[PDB]
């Protein structure tokens, strides 16, 4: 919502979310506290909507725009797990950082072979 206020002024804003996965987990913990039936892999039933209501507010507009850079953590290295599978549906680009490219003494350590953009 602070970024939406800057967007109304007609700026091109940039919004960082430092772990979208933890946003998903906080939704799971709250859903269990309310007591709603578990879904999928133990996530909340509302998972695909709790993610959509956030990810859909950060768009361009006639007046201005918000871009977003979101750090992602994938459980068990499983790109099929419901949380990554729900997140990637919204991602446009994807930059992968590498330990190797760094150890070679190159910065930024972006892996040019795994990075992609639609």
């Amino acid at each position: 919502t602070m970024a939406e206020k800057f967007r109304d002024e007609g700026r091109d804003v940039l919004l960082f979310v430092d772990n979208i996965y933890r946003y998903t987990l906080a939704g799971t913990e709250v859903s269990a506290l309310l007591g709603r039936m578990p879904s999928a892999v133990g996530y909340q039933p509302t998972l695909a909507e709790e993610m959509g209501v956030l990810q859909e507010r950060i768009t361009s507009t006639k007046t201005g725009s918000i871009t977003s850079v979101q750090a992602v953590y994938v459980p068990a290295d499983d790109l099929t797990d419901p949380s990554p599978a729900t997140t990637f549906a919204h991602l446009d680009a994807t930059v992968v950082l590498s330990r190797q490219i760094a150890s070679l003494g190159i910065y930024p350590a972006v892996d040019p072979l795994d990075s992609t953009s639609r």
């Binding site: 709603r36 999928a40 039933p45 509302t46 695909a48 909507e49 790109l79």
Partner: protein, 85 residues
């Protein structure tokens, strides 16, 4: 007619069904997740001319109507063996 994701319909129906406390089946999906898509896609049909006459009160003769459907499904890791696919 193109249904741009039946996967996302099935997920929304799963949400509605779990909020109504209904016992889920495989992959947390409700028991009637097959009837959900069945009673939808079974409408894409071609109908013979007698049915068209009977329906439209004789206003049309000899023409056979049709509805063609191209549902889209998204599958994880190219797994054609999942539940909803």
């Amino acid at each position: 007619i193109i249904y741009d994701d039946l996967s996302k319909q099935a997920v929304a129906y799963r949400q509605i069904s779990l909020l109504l406390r209904r016992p889920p089946g495989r992959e947390a999906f409700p028991g009637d997740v097959f009837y959900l898509h069945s009673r939808l896609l079974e409408r894409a049909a071609r109908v013979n001319a007698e049915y068209v006459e009977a329906f439209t009160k004789g206003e049309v003769k000899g023409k056979t109507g049709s509805l063609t459907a191209l549902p889209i499904i998204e599958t994880q890791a190219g797994d054609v063996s999942a539940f909803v696919p």
